[PDB]
Swiss-Prot record, chain A:
This is 26S proteasome regulatory subunit 7 homolog. The N-terminus is blocked. Interacts with UBR1 and CIC1. Present with 105 molecules/cell in log phase SD medium. It comes from the Eukaryota. The gene is RPT1.
Curated annotation (Swiss-Prot), chain B:
Keywords: Acetylation, ATP-binding, Nucleotide-binding, Proteasome. One of its GO terms (molecular function) is proteasome-activating activity. The keyword Nucleotide-binding applies. This is 26S proteasome subunit RPT4.
UniProtKB/Swiss-Prot annotation, chain C:
One of its GO terms (molecular function) is ATP hydrolysis activity. One of its GO terms (cellular component) is cytoplasm. This is 26S proteasome regulatory subunit 6A. It is found in: Cytoplasm; Nucleus. Its main location: cytoplasm. The keyword Isomerase does not apply. The modification Phosphotyrosine is found at residue 35. The chain holds residues 146 to 362 of 434 of the full protein. Keywords: Acetylation, ATP-binding, Cytoplasm, Nucleotide-binding, Nucleus, Phosphoprotein, Proteasome. The 26S proteasome is involved in the ATP-dependent degradation of ubiquitinated proteins. The regulatory (or ATPase) complex confers ATP dependency and substrate specificity to the 26S complex. Belongs to the AAA ATPase family. N-acetylated by NAT1. ATP binds at residues 77-84.
Length: 61, 361, 217
């Protein structure tokens, strides 16, 4: 996956112990901790992966 | 018996302390059911049953009224409160400037003294006479029948301690110092850029006396890039607003605007014409007298062995303003960190002023 | 600060942030380089140490002496000698956080946002202190000319001005350093005349026989 910011626009599933990551001007959801070999994160409002701000979808798809 | 009395006083504390914390968290749920509501500002009142209000969520709506209003705090251009689910005027608010630090950073007074920066004397006096005298005493300008001064320009180096002077004038009047980033007046949305000029002026009138200080004017007062346009129409949109306030029925005399730029060769011709700037202060070469005062002042706060002959130091320059003089001070200090001391000789000071002179003009 | 979705009321406060965090900045906590890795550049080590390193180290000493600290240098003169490499060395030695801030990223075509970026840089730099803000280019906090095209080049006048206004704001305390680097000195607004701005103007010469030989070893 290409992407220039991550944007999972909801995140019900998934410091911190759960992901809620959405990198945008108009709102923000911020979690510092990626990984998540179960559920395998991603899904949601799809652009997902590492961020040009380094919050980061680290390693789902 | 006796022990129960010890513990009775104690466990009544162990309560009282919990109870107050505990009542408060319960108040957070109560507040969560005590909802807020959004603010917009009245564009214009059509009728007492029809208004145009611009909600801050963006679009314009025709609204009527609802319970819990006053109709005598209503006027055009006041902020109002509107319902989330009924979109009608539930209560009427004052209108508010909003204090900011983003697009107008406000510093009541200045953070550096006017008498303490003396040796910058010439500039100090010109600035007093345009600013201080009308602000304290409108009455004298009014009796003659020629208006109080408009707008002042400081031109020549910002790095010689221009900036220091602007803060310093604000300090003595007790004026509200309004520092503006000219680019920040460059929002890319409909009217945000109109809104800022308007807010800045309105607040100046309330919080008058005030200095409105415009940092490097080329971006809100260009000339055009080449006669062409890329983004140099945003510059024109800005610039017409400043000329309009000036030309207007509203008159500058307890709100003073001071423009600053290195060069006068990217000021607009409008501004250079009298009646949008009329006072133009230039930053000069010092006297022999100016240099002495500033050397003495800088070395007074400084720790030194030996009485210093400032008079030699002055000869060793030719027209150093306060910023140039400071580089000479630290230079001396560098051989003193090396000589493992917090003091400096006369001897250091002669060498120091000369090395700084040679490395530039 | 944390506001209810449909009740519009501040329940809680969340940490600070304005735009994305570290958006124009690269963060490298403490370079791996040393002046035992970079060597033969010794004279450029002397200049560099007297302008920035000694005011940082002996900050207290500058306070008691009761002069203010210069916080800044400007370097011009040729790299291709390990200019970048020297900068990182100083960073390692003082135990500064090295922040590579690229001057083209600010220079935004959008309003102000660039101005805010300059302030955020100072803000993090002041929290992380010691810090060197190392500025790739000088062409986009400068090159504004003196003609009537200085109009177009506003974004660049504003990013620079703020960074200086902010340094002299805090000149007595040595926490943050600013270094700009280029091949050669460009047209700029006056700033070489003042301790609290980028006072120091450091030249790179070329090597000599002793220097080439160390560089070869």
């Amino acid at each position: 996956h290409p992407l220039q910011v991550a944007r999972c626009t909801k995140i019900i599933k998934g410091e911190d112990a759960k992901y809620v990551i959405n990198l945008k001007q108009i709102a923000k959801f911020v979690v510092g901790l990626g990984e998540r070999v179960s559920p395998t994160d991603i899904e949601e409002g799809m652009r997902v992966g590492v961020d040009r701000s380094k919050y980061n979808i680290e390693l789902p798809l | 018996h006796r022990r129960y009395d010890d513990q009775l006083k104690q466990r009544r504390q162990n309560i009282r302390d919990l109870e107050k914390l505990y009542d408060k968290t319960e108040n957070d749920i109560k507040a969560l059911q005590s909802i807020g509501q959004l603010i917009g500002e009245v564009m214009k009142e059509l009728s007492e049953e029809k208004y145009i209000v611009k909600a801050s969520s963006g679009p314009r709506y025709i609204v009527g009224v609802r319970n819990s209003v006053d109709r005598s705090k209503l006027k055009k251009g006041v902020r109002v409160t509107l319902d989330i689910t009924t979109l009608t005027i539930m209560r009427i608010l004052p209108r508010e400037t909003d204090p900011l630090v983003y697009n107008m950073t406000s510093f009541e007074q200045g953070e550096i003294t006017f008498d303490g920066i003396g040796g910058l004397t010439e500039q100090i006096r010109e600035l007093r006479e345009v600013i201080e005298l009308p602000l304290k005493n409108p009455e004298i300008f009014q009796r003659v029948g020629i208006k109080p001064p408009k707008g002042v320009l400081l031109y020549g180096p910002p790095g010689t301690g221009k900036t220091l002077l602007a803060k310093a004038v604000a300090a003595t009047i007790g004026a509200n110092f309004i520092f503006s980033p000219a680019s920040g007046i460059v929002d890319k949305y409909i009217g945000e850029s109109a809104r800022i000029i308007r807010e800045m002026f309105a607040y100046a009138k309330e919080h008058e006396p005030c200095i409105i200080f415009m940092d490097e004017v080329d971006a809100i007062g260009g000339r055009r890039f080449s006669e062409g346009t890329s983004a140099d129409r945003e510059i024109q949109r800005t610039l017409m607003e400043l000329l309009t306030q000036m030309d207007g029925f509203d008159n500058l005399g307890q709100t003073k605007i001071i423009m600053a730029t290195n060069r006068p060769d990217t000021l607009d011709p409008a501004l250079l014409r009298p009646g949008r700037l009329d006072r133009k202060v230039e930053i000069p070469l010092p006297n022999e007298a100016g240099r002495l005062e500033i050397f003495k002042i800088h070395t007074a706060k400084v720790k030194k062995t030996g009485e210093f002959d400032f008079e030699a130091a002055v000869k060793m320059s030719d027209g150093f303003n306060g910023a140039d003089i400071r580089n000479c001070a630290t230079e001396a200090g560098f051989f003193a960190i090396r000589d493992d001391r917090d003091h400096i000789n006369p001897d250091d000071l002669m060498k120091a002023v000369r090395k700084v002179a040679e490395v530039k003009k | 600060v944390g506001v209810n979705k449909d009740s519009y009321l501040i329940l809680d406060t969340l940490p600070s942030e304005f735009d994305s965090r570290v958006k124009a900045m690269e963060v490298d906590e403490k370079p791996t380089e040393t002046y035992s890795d970079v060597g033969g550049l010794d004279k450029q080590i002397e200049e560099l140490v007297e302008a920035i390193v000694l005011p940082m180290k002996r900050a207290d000493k500058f306070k008691d002496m009761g002069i203010r600290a210069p916080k800044g240098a400007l370097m011009y003169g040729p790299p291709g000698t390990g200019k970048t490499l020297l900068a990182r060395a100083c960073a390692a030695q003082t135990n500064a956080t090295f922040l590579k801030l690229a001057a083209p990223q600010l220079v935004q075509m959008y309003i102000g946002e660039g101005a805010k970026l300059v302030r955020d840089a100072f803000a993090l730099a002041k929290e992380k202190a010691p810090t060197i803000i190392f500025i790739d280019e000088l062409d986009a906090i400068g090159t504004k000319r003196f003609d009537s095209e200085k109009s177009g080049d506003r974004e660049v006048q504003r990013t620079m001005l703020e960074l200086l206004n902010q340094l002299d704001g805090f000149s007595s305390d040595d926490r943050v350093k600013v270094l700009a680097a280029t091949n050669r000195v460009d047209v700029l607004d006056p700033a070489l005349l003042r301790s609290g701005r980028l006072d120091r103007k450091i030249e790179f010469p070329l090597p000599s026989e002793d220097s080439r030989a160390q560089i070869l070893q």
